[PDB]
Amino acid sequence: ADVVVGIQWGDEGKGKIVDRIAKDYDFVVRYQGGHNAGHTIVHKGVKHSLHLMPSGVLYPKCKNIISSAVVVSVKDLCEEISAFEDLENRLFVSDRAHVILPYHAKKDAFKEKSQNIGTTKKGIGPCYEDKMARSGIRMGDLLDDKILEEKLNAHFKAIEPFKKAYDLGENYEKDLMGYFKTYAPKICPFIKDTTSMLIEANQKGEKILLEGAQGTLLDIDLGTYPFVTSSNTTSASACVSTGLNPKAINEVIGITKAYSTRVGNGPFPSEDTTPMGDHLRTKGAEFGTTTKRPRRCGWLDLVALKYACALNGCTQLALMKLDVLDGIDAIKVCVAYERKGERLEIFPSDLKDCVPIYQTFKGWEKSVGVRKLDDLEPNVREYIRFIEKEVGVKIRLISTSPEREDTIFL
Amino acid sequence: ADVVVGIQWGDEGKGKIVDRIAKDYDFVVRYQGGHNAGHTIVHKGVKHSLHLMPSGVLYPKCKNIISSAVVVSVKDLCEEISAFEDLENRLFVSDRAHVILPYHAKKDAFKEKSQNIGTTKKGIGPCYEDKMARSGIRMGDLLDDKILEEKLNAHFKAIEPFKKAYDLGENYEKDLMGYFKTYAPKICPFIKDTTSMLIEANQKGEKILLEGAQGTLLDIDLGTYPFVTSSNTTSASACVSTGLNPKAINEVIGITKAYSTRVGNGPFPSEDTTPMGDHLRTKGAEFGTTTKRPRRCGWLDLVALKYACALNGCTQLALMKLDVLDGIDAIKVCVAYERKGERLEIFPSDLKDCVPIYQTFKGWEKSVGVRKLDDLEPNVREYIRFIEKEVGVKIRLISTSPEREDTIFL
Ligand SMILES: Nc1nc2c(ncn2[C@@H]2O[C@H](COP(=O)(O)OP(=O)(O)O)[C@@H](O)[C@H]2O)c(=O)[nH]1
Ligand SMILES: Nc1nc2c(ncn2[C@@H]2O[C@H](COP(=O)(O)OP(=O)(O)O)[C@@H](O)[C@H]2O)c(=O)[nH]1
Ligand SMILES: O=P(O)(O)OC[C@H]1O[C@@H](n2cnc3c(OP(=O)(O)O)ncnc32)[C@H](O)[C@@H]1O
Ligand SMILES: O=P(O)(O)OC[C@H]1O[C@@H](n2cnc3c(OP(=O)(O)O)ncnc32)[C@H](O)[C@@H]1O
Ligand SMILES: O=CN(O)CC(=O)O
Ligand SMILES: O=CN(O)CC(=O)O
Ligand SMILES: [Mg+2]
Ligand SMILES: [Mg+2]
Numbered sequence: 001a002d003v004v005v006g007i008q009w010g011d012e013g014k015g016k017i018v019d020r021i022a023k024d025y026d027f028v029v030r031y032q033g034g035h036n037a038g039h040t041i042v043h044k045g046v047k048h049s050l051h052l053m054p055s056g057v058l059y060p061k062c063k064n065i066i067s068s069a070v071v072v073s074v075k076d077l078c079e080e081i082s083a084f085e086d087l088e089n090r091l092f093v094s095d096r097a098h099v100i101l102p103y104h105a106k107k108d109a110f111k112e113k114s115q116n117i118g119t120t121k122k123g124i125g126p127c128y129e130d131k132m133a134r135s136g137i138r139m140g141d142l143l144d145d146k147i148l149e150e151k152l153n154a155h156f157k158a159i160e161p162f163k164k165a166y167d168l169g170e171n172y173e174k175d176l177m178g179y180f181k182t183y184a185p186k187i188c189p190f191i192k193d194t195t196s197m198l199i200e201a202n203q204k205g206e207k208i209l210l211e212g213a214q215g216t217l218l219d220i221d222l223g224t225y226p227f228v229t230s231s232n233t234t235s236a237s238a239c240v241s242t243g244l245n246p247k248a249i250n251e252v253i254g255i256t257k258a259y260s261t262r263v264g265n266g267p268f269p270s271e272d273t274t275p276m277g278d279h280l281r282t283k284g285a286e287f288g289t290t291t292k293r294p295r296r297c298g299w300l301d302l303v304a305l306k307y308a309c310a311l312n313g314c315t316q317l318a319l320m321k322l323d324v325l326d327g328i329d330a331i332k333v334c335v336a337y338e339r340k341g342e343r344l345e346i347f348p349s350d351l352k353d354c355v356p357i358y359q360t361f362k363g364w365e366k367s368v369g370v371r372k373l374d375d376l377e378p379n380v381r382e383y384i385r386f387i388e389k390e391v392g393v394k395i396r397l398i399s400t401s402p403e404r405e406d407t408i409f410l
Numbered sequence: 411a412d413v414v415v416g417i418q419w420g421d422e423g424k425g426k427i428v429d430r431i432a433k434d435y436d437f438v439v440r441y442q443g444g445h446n447a448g449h450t451i452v453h454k455g456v457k458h459s460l461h462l463m464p465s466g467v468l469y470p471k472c473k474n475i476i477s478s479a480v481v482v483s484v485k486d487l488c489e490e491i492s493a494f495e496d497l498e499n500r501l502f503v504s505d506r507a508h509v510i511l512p513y514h515a516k517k518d519a520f521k522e523k524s525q526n527i528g529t530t531k532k533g534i535g536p537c538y539e540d541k542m543a544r545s546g547i548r549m550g551d552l553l554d555d556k557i558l559e560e561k562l563n564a565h566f567k568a569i570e571p572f573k574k575a576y577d578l579g580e581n582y583e584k585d586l587m588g589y590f591k592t593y594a595p596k597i598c599p600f601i602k603d604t605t606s607m608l609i610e611a612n613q614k615g616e617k618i619l620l621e622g623a624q625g626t627l628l629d630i631d632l633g634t635y636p637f638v639t640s641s642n643t644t645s646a647s648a649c650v651s652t653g654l655n656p657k658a659i660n661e662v663i664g665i666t667k668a669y670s671t672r673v674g675n676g677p678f679p680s681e682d683t684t685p686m687g688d689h690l691r692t693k694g695a696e697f698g699t700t701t702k703r704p705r706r707c708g709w710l711d712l713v714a715l716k717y718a719c720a721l722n723g724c725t726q727l728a729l730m731k732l733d734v735l736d737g738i739d740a741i742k743v744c745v746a747y748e749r750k751g752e753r754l755e756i757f758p759s760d761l762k763d764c765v766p767i768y769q770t771f772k773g774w775e776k777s778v779g780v781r782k783l784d785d786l787e788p789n790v791r792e793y794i795r796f797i798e799k800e801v802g803v804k805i806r807l808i809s810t811s812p813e814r815e816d817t818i819f820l
Contacts, residue, residue: 068631095759096631117544128542132535134527134636140759161571193759195632199720221478221506221651222605226544236649236656241631245723246646246656310609313655349505349550349603 001208001244002251003235006215007308009224009262011288011295012255013320013399015039018055018211020397020404021253025209027063027201028056031238032231033213034071034100034127036120038289042402049289053080053091055211060090065194068096069231069241071127072139074183081186093187094194095140096241100127102176103159106166117227118264120291128230139191142184152176198243208248210238216308217262224351227266235312254314254393256305257321258331258383261295263288267351270334271298284324299358301334302390307347309391318397319387322380323368331383332358335390361386370400373408411618411654412661413645416625417718419634419672421698421705422665423730423809425449428465428621430807430814431663435619437473437611438466441648442641443623444481444510444537446530448699452812459699463490463501465621470500475604478506479641479651481537482549484593491596503597504604505550506651510537512586513569516576527637528674530701538640549601552594562586608653618658620648626718627672634761637676645722664724664803666715667731668741668793671705673698677761680744681708694734709768711744712800717757719801728807729797732790733778741793742768745800771796780810783818 002025006012019041022028030037035051041058042048048058052072056062066072072093081087104123111126112119119125130136135158137151156173159166169175201208212233217223219233232240235252239245259280262268271277277297280286286295308314325331334356337344344354364377373381376398388395398408412435416422429451432438440447445461451468452458458468462482466472476482482503491497514533521536522529529535540546545568547561566583569576579585611618622643627633629643642650645662649655669690672678681687687707690696696705718724735741744766747754754764774787783791786808798805808818 096635111543115544125542125544129539131630132538132542132640133521134525134535134630134638134640138635195759196756199717203720219651220541220544222653225506225548228544230542230544232650234650234655236646236654239646239656240642240644240650241629243632243721244646245644245662245721246649246659247662247723247725249656252655252657307609310613311653311655313657315657346606349605 001202001210001238001248002253003210003212003238003249004253004255005212005233005235005312007254007256007305007312007314008215008260009217010215011261011263012215012257013318014212014255015041015050015055016320016399016402016404017253017255017318017397018209019043019058020407022056022062022209023059024207025056025062026206027065027198027208028054029065029067029198029208029210029242030054030070030213031067031210031242032069032233033229034122034124035073035076036122036124036229036290037213040289040402041404043404051080051290052077056209057084060086062090064091065197066093066097067194067242068094069237070094070097071100071124072097073100073122074187075179078183078186088189091190092192092194092197093139093190095138095143095191096195097139098127098131099137099139100124101137101155103155103166103168106168107162110166116265118266125230142180142188143191148180152180195243202244202248208244210242212238216311217304222311224266227264251316252312252314253316253318253397254309254312255318255320257300258319258325259300259321260298261286263291263293263295268296268298269337269351269354270301270356271296280324284321299332299334299356300387301356302387303334303337303344303347305391309393314393316396317391317393318399319384319395320399322398323400325363326365326367328363331361331363333361333386335359367400369406371406371408373410411612411620411648411658412663413620413622413648413659414663414665415622415643415645415722417664417666417715417722417724418625418670419627420625421671421673422625422667423728424622424665425451425460425465426730426809426812426814427663427665427728427807428619429453429468430817432466432472432619433469434617435466435472436616437475437608437618438464439475439477439608439618439620439652440464440480440623441477441620441652442479442643443639444532444534445483445486446532446534446639446700447623450699450812451814453814461490461700462487466619467494470496472500474501475607476503476507477604477652478504479647480504480507481510481534482507483510483532484597485589488593488596498599501600502602502604502607503549503600505548505553505601506605507549508537508541509547509549510534511547511565513565513576513578516578517572520576526675528676535640552590552598553601558590562590605653612654612658618654620652622648626721627714632721634676637674661726662722662724663726663728663807664719664722665728665730667710668729668735669710669731670708671696673701673703673705678706678708679747679761679764680711680766681706690734694731709742709744709766710797711766712797713744713747713754713757715801719803724803726806727801727803728809729794729805730809732808733810735773736775736777738773741771741773743771743796745769777810779816781816781818783820
């Protein structure tokens with residue numbers, strides 16, 4: 001199995017890369033996160049913004065799997081399903097995936113008033129909380145009405161003291177029963193034991209592609225806590241809960257932009273808050289695929305990149321959005337941190353007082369839409385060479401526009 | 411890096427195996443769980459029951475690491491530290507590990523009144539809940555008094571509505587400040603960036619052994635939910651949050667008993683509730699290393715074992731407690747499940763109505779203390795051969811008593 005992982009703070013271009021390479025796989029698997037994710041595919045002038053639907057959906061011969069460590073908003077997934085034809089037998093949702101309830105999004109919004117993490121307000125964190133509490137509802141529960149009713153009854157009891165605090169509707173209980181009466185029949189045909197499916201697929205030598213969501217620096221354990229998502233986002237997360245094991249991982253494709261973004265609060269050493277950062281936002285159209293929030297923009301940070309590469313075991317890199325830098329006279333790359341007169345070459349566990357140390361590169365003019373290495377300007381290829389040398393991983397895919405085919409393969 | 415994982419429901423003999431093989435490693439790493447774990451080492455008539463302390467502690471040249479996905483009761487860890495000499499520079503606790511507060515154990519006990527999971531009542535689940543909420547305190551916070559005070563102040567506000575419900579002391583707030591004034595100075599010298607330590611150790615080719623806690627069937631995602639622990643327990647969990655990556659995993663040693671146990675509630679297809687199960691409990695001294703609860707006992711279940719082997723990628727097996735079966739005339743092994751007239755060869759996602767189908771093996775008389783394959787009775791070796799054939803993984807370690815040296819290496 002191969003894994004596509006974002007090695008920054010999300011939105012690196014994972015949807016584009018997965019869609020570009022998915023034709024050569026039998027399964028494409030979303031393995032963590034929820035509909036906080038937003039993965040944009042563009043082909044022939046048509047854009048799809050996927051949230052939980054895996055990015056193999058444009059190849060009908062692929063089997064798309066939503067695996068057990070995902071958190072599922074059933075209504076939102078059904079709305080994604082309605083955008084494609086004949087998804088029966090090419091989309092499967094794990095019976096072990098946990099279910100996001102409206103309470104979760106209301107609780108997310110409420111706690112955000114005081115925590116100020118900048119979550120997507122989709123209820124992801126609270127759903128993972130109920131999973132750890134072992135009180136959460138799983139997709140398999142939707143297959144039996146009596147089991148679902150017992151679990152919903154426990155949920156109604158458990159949340160009663162928070163009805164006013166969380167601004168829960170006075171018809172919350174009747175509305176939620178009606179929610180499942182509406183959406184359970186639509187989603188139930190897709191619910192399967194996907195763990196067994198992937199155990200068997202691995203044993204049979206089928207080609208499996210695992211699609212990460214978020215990025216390494218948003219990992220609950222190893223990212224910029226508490227400014228992180230509530231799931232593990234590294235490549236090993238793809239073999240924790242899918243039915244695969246670490247020995248099955250072959251290629252690990254780390255996705256990185258030629259600059260940096262994050263959306264929401266938290267440390268960002270190479271952030272550019274000057275009008276150049278605003279230029280990156282405008283030219284790169286850096287607005288959240290899910291929330292439409294303006295992203296924070298900055299320069300590529302190789303200290304953080306080396307850390308993420310180590311945690312993932314990247315065997316190749318995909319370098320994205322080189323075209324956004326067209327016309328910028330000087331490109332900065334953070335190669336180290338200064339901290340109180342100390343030069344840090346290694347990503348620390350606390351980013352307080354870490355100031356970027358920049359190396360500057362000569363810019364280029366017209367990488368947009370280029371499809372051959374021969375046609376890239378010398379200064380682009382010099383930038384690429386530097387990144388490869390510093391990180392120690394070959395850049396094998398280069399993206400020069402949102403379009404699927406505007407990609408160089410090496 | 412090599413990984414030792416329990417492939418049943420915990421208590422397979424992981425502490426014994428890790429201690430038996432740890433002399434040949436530079437690092438021994440606990441990577442998940444908390445002091446719910448209880449790992450028993452016996453050597454020369456002296457027993458150590460470890461809970462969070464890694465099982466390389468009896469080899470002073472080893473470096474023992476408590477990694478980031480662990481949950482840490484500081485008082486309990488300090489009490490373990492006091493049992494060994496000169497642990498400075500051979501024990502390191504990740505600055506990213508989360509801290510178990512007394513509130514967590516009180517909340518665990520309270521929710522257990524209605525959930526009846528049968529947790530160890532150590533506060534593990536609630537601590538992982540606060541991690542997903544991104545409100546949890548991490549070990550690195552203990553290194554700065556101002557940061558700890560701000561986080562404790564938020565904790566006091568957050569828990570106030572539960573003071574009566576959870577039977578929190580009226581001096582809870584002053585007691586908890588005093589708790590950290592007592593224990594933070596003792597633990598602070600051990601707190602380090604262990605992620606960077608293991609990134610570097612892996613890059614340098616040092617020998618790393620990862621010690622699992624619990625077992626595969628207790629995995630939060632893929633185990634017998636909700637009768638599971640709140641962490642991931644498979645071998646990939648060892649490369650999610652430690653600083654390693656899946657490509658670094660070499661050997662995966664799956665630890666299994668020659669029969670089965672679980673402690674706490676939940677499905678157990680091969681459970682034996684007759685006096686034979688009571689005999690297994692007495693002869694095997696099957697009482698929880700942590701809680702002293704009597705374990706539920708039963709027969710080896712190869713359907714569940716094949717599932718766990720697939721999730722972990724086991725390259726070798728360690729077969730434990732063969733000596734407990736000495737004198738039993740017929741040994742049963744569950745080779746399949748019957749479910750409503752259907753024969754299941756593959757572990758299903760719901761164990762309801764699954765009845766064990768048994769194959770019977772001729773017993774043996776005196777495997778206890780045997781140290782050479784030549785000295786094992788033919789019927790023992792026939793049993794071993796069958797397990798290896800059915801599971802497809804070679805049994806490389808055979809344990810014939812609690813003692814470190816009562817182990818056969820192949
Ligand atoms: N200009 C440009 N845009 C790109 C390129 N690759 C992807 N995109 C667009 O960049 C944005 C990436 O954000 P997003 O879809 O959230 O990334 P993901 O979450 O990693 O899939 C989307 O609008 C993509 O269509 C590229 O090479 N150049
Ligand atoms: N009789 C016998 N006891 C064993 C053997 N291996 C380990 N033990 C004991 O079996 C129990 C294993 O439970 P525990 O320590 O909780 O296992 P762990 O959690 O996997 O380390 C302990 O009392 C060990 O001392 C064996 O081969 N034979
Ligand atoms: O509890 P959450 O709702 O998950 O928010 C926690 C933090 O993580 C951010 N976040 C969550 N998903 C993100 C994403 O997804 P993709 O790369 O898959 O498209 N890309 C970028 N940022 C993302 C949020 O802004 C916030 O900072
Ligand atoms: O929330 P928790 O306190 O973790 O309880 C959840 C469930 O998991 C059991 N449990 C937890 N740790 C266990 C263990 O550890 P070692 O193998 O590492 O010694 N061995 C066996 N069972 C174990 C508990 O009995 C319960 O069923
Ligand atoms: O693509 C998804 N994001 O950028 C998260 C968001 O929209 O906030
Ligand atoms: O070794 C630890 N266990 O068996 C868990 C417990 O004691 O309950
Ligand atoms: Mg996105
Ligand atoms: Mg134990």
